[PDB]
Design a protein around this nucleic acid. Structure first.
Ligand SMILES: [Mn+2]
Ligand SMILES: [Mn+2]
Ligand SMILES: [Mn+2]
Ligand SMILES: [Mn+2]
Ligand SMILES: [Mn+2]
Ligand SMILES: [Mn+2]
Ligand SMILES: [Mn+2]
Ligand SMILES: [Mn+2]
Ligand SMILES: [Mn+2]
Ligand SMILES: [Mn+2]
Ligand SMILES: [Mn+2]
Ligand SMILES: [Mn+2]
Ligand SMILES: [Mn+2]
Ligand SMILES: [Mn+2]
Lengths: 106, 86, 99, 97, 94, 105, 82, 99
DNA sequence: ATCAATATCCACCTGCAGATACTACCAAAAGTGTATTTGGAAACTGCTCCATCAAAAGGCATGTTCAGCTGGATTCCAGCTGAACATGCCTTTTGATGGAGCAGTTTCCAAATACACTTTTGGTAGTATCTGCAGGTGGATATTGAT
DNA sequence: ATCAATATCCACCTGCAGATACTACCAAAAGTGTATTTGGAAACTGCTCCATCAAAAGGCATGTTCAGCTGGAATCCAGCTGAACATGCCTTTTGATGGAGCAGTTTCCAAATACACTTTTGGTAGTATCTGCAGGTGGATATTGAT
């Protein structure tokens, strides 16, 4: 019986779809078999990383459902995700609470 | 029939709306000349994105600007936007 | 006898309020008219997906908020608390938006 | 007439969410953000891999191109963990069949 | 050994059209080469995205044209579109 | 045998531009007019820069264009400066420019 | 003498760079500040350059390695190939 | 009395001198020493094409000159003519190179 | 105003590094011609969703008054930073000299593509029922500002 | 400090939009197996150019002195801009409806690819002559700064 390439790789993200998107995307003449596996794993990993931190932000705000606000808090409060997505706008994400010290009353 | 002439709608970007945006940006005090300056800056930004978006629309031979038209336009200008079909 | 908060107290209250929330701060219908007016001047007889207008407003407000942040830093750099046109202009210059 | 299929990473994003936060849900707008994110990073990595292949006169994008692209694109710790996950997945995939 | 292609002899040709009595140093020629390669990549890349966005497998002169409009500022774009259309019209009539 | 370049009235290599498009993985297929259009655009932009650069050379009492002249031509031209806003020209230097507040008296 | 390599980037050289940048007057703390910024710039570009070198299985950093590195950092450079 | 130009006069002279020319302003060998040192931290036993180091110095000097321009505008914004660390820091922040 | 110390400019000259013009060689590239194939324009049209209308109402914009405190102007002076100059250290030069290793060539096989066939699945559609939390209320706690 | 006005907090609640659940259905996706092709690793080698070395030479960095003038601290005050209020407009909300035009399906040929074959060309390598301009000169005069 047939096992999927994802299961064979131990991945949740779809290896077959990633391979298809690579071939259709005009990135190169040929695509090695290991390329969609490696790529699917990285995407799956980065997703887990964001969801972990987003779920924590939801929890901090006494919520059980992640909304864009939680995704924004997770990304901007994490230095490496902030860097990776530094030129990205999260719709309905808002901004981090931040008041310049000199603006506070004495 | 055709719609009423559209003009002077930049003034629909009101002073309290601009104040609100500045507050989210962490601004505490605002000069009186800021409001006209912001409208001019906003118009330039909008014009540039809309120009690119409509260009995508025309190339697809459509008469309707899609969310993707806008998303693509924002992307090529370095304002990548998530949440509308990226 | 009537109660008055000092100048700056409410402004600070407003900063905390709006930095906590995510809703759009520009009225929906007037922004849509601006979009249609500008687009019309580029090409007549255009129609818009409603999500296209919303995508434009999300991007526009994010840009302006980000710009006011840099503008604020320029004002503070000059030992001011009040943002002025020249603060915006310096910010945009260094950004390379008018360099 | 039938509306043609619109593919997304939703069911896979959802699976991963349940792994890291079993009792946590996600709104459709937030899921829209996540799908944009995956598409974005896909293109960034695939794009860098493409250039890299071309620079070296190779017609094939292998896992080695992907790995180098990951190192060029991702910041320190993210790159480290991504590479190990990618390497592990490949060696496991090949050790089968 | 091998051969290294560049745009040098074509850039030089164009130089003689616009300035018959003007030369160009090798370093300056290297910069012109970088310029041509850069703009090629930008235009081809945008044209590539345009085709992909519209689910087409072919890059035609129409994709090059829209790409030019997207990439070049006002007047440069106008003249570039004109020159591009001219060369395609002339190439067709032959 | 007559070249596609001569056929299109161009100095820039149509055939090479076509080969470069095919091998660049930009798309599955390339139309016939595409490399002609692109070659014309590249030739025009080249002419525009050499014109202004040559003028810069003449203004500096030179007959040979060097990197400096290319930089002067591009930075002094609003549209070229914008197109190449994120590009560094080696040995190009900068435009003479002193902020007024720094001048004496 | 035993001096760090970044300290080889001298005060007069930094002064000259500032002059070309149109700077008339310079604070004494600028020079150390500049060296730190310079080092970060080089670290970021060279890291990427070497990554290209490694991928090509070479032991020699080429100009194209550097040019490619600069482009993806958004510092496109004309005059050294590509 | 012996001859002395006022402070600022020679500075302005140098500005005109170096804005006129295109030669690299950092000494070659010390820059080369720095490059090799940094690269050794990523990969040992490397060699460089001569053009590779030159590409790096052209890029590095162009970057610093551009940065000093923005830095200068920040100083002037605060009504100074002397550039300071906080000027460079503001410029880099607004550029998006930091913070 | 004068007047002297330098900087800066112009005209001219000459050595040479780098540009040129020449012949010749050749692989790769470009053209030409034929056979085959297929992407996508055209036609037709289903059906999503865009423009537009109405109508009620209250959230929010507008315009005003008032004065707190901010920005801008002035003054002052401590000291930092520019200018000049004396040393001498080390970058620069250049020219030769191994030899690292880039790069070109040949070999050949694991891994790619191509294809036919079969099974699996994620997307959509149709309804039908949970459920997290927005938003409203009330009342206790906290913050601000006058005194 | 006390106390009062007002914002802020949190617990509690309920309506419902939106998340969830399930069955049906199916085209596309994905996997399995077989045949055929080939990209690029591997080993070897030639020759490019990189590292190093010596060896002056002087250019340029560094340390020092002195004071001009800049940055920043302190003081004052006119009037900008924030806070609060009254008023009522126009955005928001809800819902309905025609039909523009986006998008699905099928047809079909102009233009694409794919080879084979022939011709042209750009890159090249020596080989030799040529020349634009850097760099040095003298001397005129412009600039700067002290009187
Ligand atoms: Mn109009
Ligand atoms: Mn077809
Ligand atoms: Mn009113
Ligand atoms: Mn008063
Ligand atoms: Mn003040
Ligand atoms: Mn060897
Ligand atoms: Mn299923
Ligand atoms: Mn609530
Ligand atoms: Mn082969
Ligand atoms: Mn003193
Ligand atoms: Mn001062
Ligand atoms: Mn119709
Ligand atoms: Mn020839
Ligand atoms: Mn000279």
């Amino acid at each position: 019986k047939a096992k999927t390439r994802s299961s064979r790789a131990g991945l949740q993200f779809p290896v077959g779809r990633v391979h298809r998107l690579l071939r259709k995307g005009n990135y190169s003449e040929r695509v090695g078999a290991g390329a969609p596996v490696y790529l699917a794993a990285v995407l799956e990993y980065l997703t887990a990383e964001i969801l972990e931190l987003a779920g924590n932000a939801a929890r901090d705000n006494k919520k059980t459902r992640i909304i864009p606000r939680h995704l924004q808090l997770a990304i901007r409060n994490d230095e490496e995700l902030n860097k990776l997505l530094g030129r990205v706008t999260i719709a309905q994400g808002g901004v981090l609470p931040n008041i310049q010290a000199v603006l506070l009353p004495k | 029939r055709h719609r009423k002439v559209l003009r002077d709608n930049i003034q629909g970007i009101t002073k309290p709306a601009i104040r609100r945006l500045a507050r989210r940006g962490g601004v505490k005090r605002i000069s009186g000349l800021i409001y006209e300056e912001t409208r001019g800056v906003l118009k330039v930004f909008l014009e540039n994105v809309i120009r690119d978006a409509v260009t995508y629309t025309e190339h697809a031979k459509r008469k309707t600007v899609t969310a993707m038209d806008v998303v693509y336009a924002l992307k090529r200008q370095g304002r990548t936007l998530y949440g509308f079909g990226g | 006898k009537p109660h008055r908060y000092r100048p700056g107290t409410v402004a600070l209250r407003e900063i905390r309020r709006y930095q906590k929330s995510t809703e759009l701060l520009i009225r929906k219908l007037p922004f849509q008219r601006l979009v249609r007016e500008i687009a019309q001047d580029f090409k007549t007889d255009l129609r818009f997906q409603s999500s296209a207008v919303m995508a434009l407003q999300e991007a526009c407000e994010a840009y302006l908020v980000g710009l006011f942040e840099d503008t604020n830093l320029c004002a503070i750099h000059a030992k001011r608390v009040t943002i002025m046109p020249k603060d915006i202009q310096l910010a945009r210059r260094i950004r390379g938006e008018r360099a | 007439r039938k509306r043609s299929r619109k593919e997304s990473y939703s069911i896979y994003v959802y699976k991963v969410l349940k792994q890291v936060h079993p009792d946590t849900g996600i709104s459709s707008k937030a899921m829209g953000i996540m799908n944009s994110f995956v598409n974005d990073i896909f293109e960034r990595i695939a794009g860098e891999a493409s250039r890299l292949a071309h620079y070296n006169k190779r017609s094939t994008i292998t896992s080695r191109e992907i790995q180098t692209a990951v190192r060029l694109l991702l910041p320190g710790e993210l790159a480290k963990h991504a590479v190990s996950e990618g390497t592990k997945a490949v060696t496991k995939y090949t050790s089968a069949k």
